[PDB]
Symmetry: D2
Subunit: 30 residues, 4 copies
């Protein structure tokens, strides 16, 4: 699955984009 | 869980933001 | 002209979108 | 000044972010 994350993607994931949610920027990670 | 969706959120969800990935815009739905 | 603004658009402007810049969200105002 | 551009920033500028408006993605160039 993919996840919007703060502060960063985790081990085993790659950043594929960005989420805008709750007034913050998130890494989009899969 | 929240989900990035095209074309729109499904009944029972609301749009709380936006995902940007693979050069495309997605609704962020929870 | 249009401007990316924090915290908000100003008098005489309308918000038409969002900017992502310097780790922050900005109102896109014209 | 910074500018939202399609297709890309012009020589002498760099891309520092992204604009979202009118349902479209733009390079944010300064
Ligand atoms: Cl923080
Ligand atoms: Cl602040």
């Amino acid at each position: 699955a993919c996840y919007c994350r703060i502060p960063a993607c985790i081990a085993g994931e790659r950043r594929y984009g960005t989420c805008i949610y709750q007034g913050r920027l998130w890494a989009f990670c899969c």
